[PDB]
Amino acid sequence: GAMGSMERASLIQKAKLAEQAERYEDMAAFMKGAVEKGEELSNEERCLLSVAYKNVVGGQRAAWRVLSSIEQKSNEEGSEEKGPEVREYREKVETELQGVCDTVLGLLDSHLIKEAGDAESRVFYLKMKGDYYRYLAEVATGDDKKRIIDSARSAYQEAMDISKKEMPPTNPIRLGLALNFSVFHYEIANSPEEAISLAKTTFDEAMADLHTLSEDSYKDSTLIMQLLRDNLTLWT
Amino acid sequence: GAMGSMERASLIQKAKLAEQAERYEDMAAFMKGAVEKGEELSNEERCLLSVAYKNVVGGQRAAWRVLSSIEQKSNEEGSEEKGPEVREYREKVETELQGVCDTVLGLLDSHLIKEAGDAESRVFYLKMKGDYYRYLAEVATGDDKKRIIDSARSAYQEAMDISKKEMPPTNPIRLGLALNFSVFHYEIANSPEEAISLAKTTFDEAMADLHTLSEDSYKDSTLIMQLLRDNLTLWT
Amino acid sequence: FPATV
Amino acid sequence: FPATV
Numbered sequence: 001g002a003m004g005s006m007e008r009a010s011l012i013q014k015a016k017l018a019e020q021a022e023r024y025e026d027m028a029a030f031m032k033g034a035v036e037k038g039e040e041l042s043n044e045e046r047c048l049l050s051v052a053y054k055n056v057v058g059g060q061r062a063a064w065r066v067l068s069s070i071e072q073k074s075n076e077e078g079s080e081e082k083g084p085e086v087r088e089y090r091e092k093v094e095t096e097l098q099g100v101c102d103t104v105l106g107l108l109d110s111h112l113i114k115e116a117g118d119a120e121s122r123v124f125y126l127k128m129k130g131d132y133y134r135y136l137a138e139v140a141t142g143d144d145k146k147r148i149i150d151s152a153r154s155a156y157q158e159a160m161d162i163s164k165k166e167m168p169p170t171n172p173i174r175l176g177l178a179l180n181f182s183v184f185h186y187e188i189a190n191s192p193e194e195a196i197s198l199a200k201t202t203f204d205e206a207m208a209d210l211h212t213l214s215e216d217s218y219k220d221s222t223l224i225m226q227l228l229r230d231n232l233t234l235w236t
Numbered sequence: 237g238a239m240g241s242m243e244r245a246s247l248i249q250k251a252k253l254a255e256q257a258e259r260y261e262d263m264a265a266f267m268k269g270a271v272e273k274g275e276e277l278s279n280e281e282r283c284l285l286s287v288a289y290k291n292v293v294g295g296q297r298a299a300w301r302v303l304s305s306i307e308q309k310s311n312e313e314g315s316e317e318k319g320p321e322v323r324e325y326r327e328k329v330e331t332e333l334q335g336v337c338d339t340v341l342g343l344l345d346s347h348l349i350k351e352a353g354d355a356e357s358r359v360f361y362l363k364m365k366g367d368y369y370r371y372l373a374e375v376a377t378g379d380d381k382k383r384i385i386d387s388a389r390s391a392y393q394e395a396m397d398i399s400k401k402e403m404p405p406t407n408p409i410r411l412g413l414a415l416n417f418s419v420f421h422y423e424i425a426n427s428p429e430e431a432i433s434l435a436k437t438t439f440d441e442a443m444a445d446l447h448t449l450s451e452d453s454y455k456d457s458t459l460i461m462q463l464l465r466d467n468l469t470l471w472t
Numbered sequence: 473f474p475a476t477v
Numbered sequence: 478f479p480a481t482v
């Protein structure tokens with residue numbers, strides 16, 4: 001690994017610098033190097049890992065959607081044949097996206113998840129596993145598409161089961177997990193009713209627990225609750 | 237070259253797709269492949285080349301400025317020693333930026349400029365040569381810094397001489413060249429008076445020529461004239 | 473698109 | 478920063 005010669009602490013330091021410079025590919029490569037040192041990640045370091053790859057794959061997904069939309073229009077009635085270029089370039093972006101997802105899933109499997117025993121780390125990593133299988137599912141069209149979808153569902157479900165047993169309903173990781181699993185139901189699994197039910201129950205159970213929280217925790221939880229509400233408003 | 241097997245027309249097609257997807261690194265690699273086919277570039281293709289590398293190096297410059305600012309604060313009085321990491325990472329971004337500039341200058345030298353005979357292509361490429369030496373000058377600190385600055389100045393000056401002889405004062409390439417050479421004077425050559433004089437004379441001479449233009453040409457020229465005015469307002 | 477975090 | 482194109 002190209003980061004094998006750099007100190008773990010220096011990799012974390014440079015990940016933070018890359019974030020300030022909005023250099024998310026660098027940030028992700030630094031955090032990949034940090035994970036491959038083999039030590040567990042702290043709360044802050046887990047955040048750096050997720051932020052880096054979320055921005056990298058988010059840009060790839062945005063680009064893939066632009067190209068897939070152009071490709072779909074090219075295949076409509078009355079459209080001029082333009083050659084293989086649009087499909088080729090959509091495939092190029094798609095392959096690069098799949099590569100990033102495979103990299104993240106590889107870090108989770110070797111060996112972040114198996115060493116994560118506390119609820120806050122294990123739920124975090126399983127949510128990530130669900131998310132990156134979800135991104136693979138967004139571009140999947142082949143024999144293994146149903147298995148990709150079920151891999152996302154299985155990871156999300158294990159994270160949900162742990163989060164409900166071990167975390168308060170206002171915990172931001174629990175809330176963000178539920179937000180994303182709800183989107184998985186709506187956009188991937190063709191289950192809009194389950195998506196709406198999960199978002200509403202998650203919102204209502206968090207609402208009832210806000211009274212236990214400090215001012216600062218209240219602000220964190222209500223921020224993600226508003227995203228649940230935004231999705232519900234989008235969907236109803 | 238990794239684009240050697242792709243058709244010139246396919247490279248241009250994919251550059252346009254990459255632009256739509258905001259994938260400017262891809263866009264630049266496609267246009268580099270197109271230039272290396274050895275044929276001259278059309279007006280539109282010159283635009284694709286400049287847009288791609290302007291966005292790539294623009295992002296690098298923004299990141300370099302963030303890191304250089306952090307580095308400067310780390311070297312102030314009372315700042316805690318944090319190790320070599322900030323300098324290392326600023327150097328990494330700086331080296332990547334220099335690499336892009338060297339690539340662009342290499343394309344201009346082999347062999348875009350020597351085959352460019354019309355004013356609109358030759359001035360365009362010489363402005364680019366001035367711009368990318370200017371970006372090298374922004375990060376230069378060594379023995380060759382004065383020579384980098386003079387390389388920018390010399391390219392800008394040749395472009396100015398041609399543009400004044402061969403183009404109307406409202407020509408957008410002439411206007412944009414003058415805009416950037418004025419910034420070179422202000423920010424690189426420590427000549428704010430020359431920067432202001434050039435921007436004002438360029439603006440006034442364009443103003444006097446607007447009456448010759450169509451509605452669409454008028455809109456193009458006045459857009460860049462407003463940038464000259466914005467800089468003058470910044471500087472006075 | 474819907475919100476995710 | 479000043480405007481360039």
Ligand SMILES: *SCCN[C@H](O)[C@H](c1ccccc1)N(C)[C@H](O)OC(C)(C)C
Nearest residue numbers: 046047172173176177220221223224477
């Ligand atoms: S990196 C984790 C810190 N961020 C939060 O836990 C939460 C989140 C939840 C699940 C997965 C990733 C991130 N953020 C979305 C929200 O925005 O964070 C605050 C605390 C509400 C600001």
Ligand SMILES: *SCCN[C@H](O)[C@H](c1ccccc1)N(C)[C@H](O)OC(C)(C)C
Nearest residue numbers: 282283408409412413456457459460482
């Ligand atoms: S790619 C060249 C087309 N753009 C214009 O010529 C001008 C420019 C000038 C010099 C170098 C690059 C670009 N643009 C800055 C302006 O904005 O273009 C219009 C025509 C005013 C829109």
Ligand SMILES: [Mg+2]
Nearest residue numbers: 006007008009
């Ligand atoms: Mg060590």
Ligand SMILES: [Mg+2]
Nearest residue numbers: 091094095139
């Ligand atoms: Mg594919």
Ligand SMILES: [Mg+2]
Nearest residue numbers: 194197198201
């Ligand atoms: Mg239920």
Ligand SMILES: [Mg+2]
Nearest residue numbers: 242243244245
């Ligand atoms: Mg050919």
Ligand SMILES: [Mg+2]
Nearest residue numbers: 327330331375
């Ligand atoms: Mg250097």
Ligand SMILES: [Mg+2]
Nearest residue numbers: 430433434437
């Ligand atoms: Mg003069």
